[PDB]
Design a protein around this ligand. Structure first.
Ligand SMILES: O=S(=O)(O)c1cccc2cccc(Nc3ccccc3)c12
Ligand SMILES: O=S(=O)(O)c1cccc2cccc(Nc3ccccc3)c12
Length: 302
């Protein structure tokens, strides 16, 4: 039987992703609580780009424990309401609440492993996230972490508004995107996740830039300014400028102090400059860093 917006009682606002506010709501007929996302459409031109429609279709096809579950899509007067499973807690909020002590390594390992499983699945199905950041990763009481807030709308020009609150998306953006690559690859998500891995460990964002050029320079100052030896083709990328300062690479003992050689090995493979050399999500799952991975439950005192 079709669901109608009248069937839902708004409880509270639980956030405001790239598509406006997200509300916790209660289904009046089943009593189930869900997360509702409101999407304002745009018949401004004539419709949604065919390629966009295909990408939304691709995302809808995915069913995985590490991808937030879409339960239904309600259509009403130029508006779309996405009905999702209810989750309300995210990695950003959790890290802020674990600021004083940091998230324990077993949980860091579990979350990273699960996010890699989610990404491996998406990537094998030709789906990229494109906007991975702590804010977009939802967690539940049982220890799962899930991908959400995919960067689909801005990537394929979907007729809908975005970033109701603001931005900070630059911090996790892969260098090939910052340098204007004609075509990027699934490797961009691995870069983002590597930044998130480092952030969980150090309790601070790795490259908190305030502009594309500042973002690039922050990356260069830490990993060294790339050259043809380290990244073949970099000096010919659209936005590459020979005038870029030349910085030497920093040691990870300094960049991510708490990590040992297994952690450093994996991090270095996730932050490799060359997209063609950056570790894939599938290969990362087999990294020695995950030998002892388990599924700890988070301490959530809401
Ligand atoms: O495919 S749907 O499941 O609706 C869908 C699900 C989730 C997000 C969507 C965003 C834009 C357009 C859609 N489709 C659409 C198609 C026809 C009319 C209005 C919207 C979206
Ligand atoms: O909301 S997200 O968490 O990204 C999301 C998560 C999981 C499955 C999704 C399926 C279709 C569209 C989404 N979002 C969407 C919304 C508006 C425009 C384009 C895509 C999905």
């Amino acid at each position: 039987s079709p669901e109608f917006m009248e069937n839902f009682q708004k409880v509270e606002k639980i956030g405001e992703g790239t598509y406006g506010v997200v509300y916790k709501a209660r289904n009046k007929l089943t009593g189930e609580v869900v997360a509702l996302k409101k999407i304002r459409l745009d018949t401004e031109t004539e419709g949604v780009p065919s390629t966009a429609i295909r990408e939304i279709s691709l995302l809808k096809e995915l069913n995985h424990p590490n991808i937030v579950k879409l339960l239904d899509v309600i259509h009403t007067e130029n508006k779309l309401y996405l009905v999702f499973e209810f989750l309300h807690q995210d990695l950003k909020k959790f890290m802020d609440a674990s600021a004083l002590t940091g998230i324990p390594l077993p949980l860091i390992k579990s979350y990273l492993f699960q996010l890699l499983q989610g990404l491996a699945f998406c990537h094998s199905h030709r789906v990229l996230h494109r906007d991975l950041k702590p804010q977009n990763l939802l967690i539940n009481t049982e220890g799962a972490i899930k991908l959400a807030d995919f960067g689909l709308a801005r990537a394929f020009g979907v007729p809908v508004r975005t970033y109701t609150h603001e931005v900070v998306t630059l911090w996790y953006r892969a260098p090939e995107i910052l340098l204007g690559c004609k075509y990027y690859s699934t490797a961009v998500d691995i870069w983002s996740l590597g930044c998130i891995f480092a952030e969980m460990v150090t309790r601070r964002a790795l490259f908190p830039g305030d502009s594309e050029i500042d973002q690039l320079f922050r990356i260069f100052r830490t990993l060294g300014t790339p050259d043809e030896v380290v990244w073949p083709g970099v000096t010919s990328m659209p936005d590459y400028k020979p005038s870029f300062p030349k910085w030497a690479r920093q040691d990870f003992s300094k960049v991510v102090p708490p990590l040992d050689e297994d952690g450093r090995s994996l991090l270095s493979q996730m932050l490799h400059y060359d997209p063609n050399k950056r570790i894939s999500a599938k290969a990362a799952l087999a990294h020695p860093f995950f030998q002892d991975v388990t599924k700890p439950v988070p301490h959530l005192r809401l």
